[PDB]
């Protein structure tokens, strides 16, 4: 009798973050500790390096998730999806 929700609950509102989905593909994020808001991934808005000082997957990335169980990489910059390129 598994409910029909918090299905993969540990990604939305894990500490502060909230993501929600655009249409777009575009995941919004607000951070309510410190009171923040970033498109896509939190890519520490123009800095883009507190994401990047431990982080080999969200540099203001998406994991692409295909029904089949595959992770791909999406970039907000060229508006791209790939197996890899950013960070292995």
């Given at each position: 009798?598994?409910?029909?929700?918090?299905?993969?609950?540990?990604?939305?509102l894990?500490?502060?973050?909230?993501?929600k989905?655009?249409?777009?593909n575009?995941?919004?994020?607000?951070?309510?500790?410190?009171?923040?808001?970033?498109?896509?991934?939190?890519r520490?808005?123009?800095?883009?390096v507190s994401?990047?000082?431990?982080?080999p997957?969200?540099?203001?990335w998406?994991?692409?998730?295909?029904?089949?169980?595959?992770?791909?990489?999406?970039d907000?910059?060229?508006?791209?999806?790939?197996?890899?390129?950013?960070?292995?």
């Amino acid at each position: 009798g598994s409910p029909e929700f918090h299905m993969d609950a540990l990604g939305p509102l894990p500490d502060g973050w909230e993501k929600k989905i655009q249409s777009d593909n575009r995941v919004y994020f607000v951070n309510h500790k410190n009171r923040t808001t970033q498109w896509e991934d939190p890519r520490t808005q123009g800095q883009e390096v507190s994401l990047i000082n431990e982080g080999p997957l969200p540099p203001g990335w998406e994991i692409r998730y295909t029904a089949a169980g595959e992770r791909f990489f999406v970039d907000h910059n060229t508006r791209r999806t790939t197996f890899e390129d950013p960070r292995p």
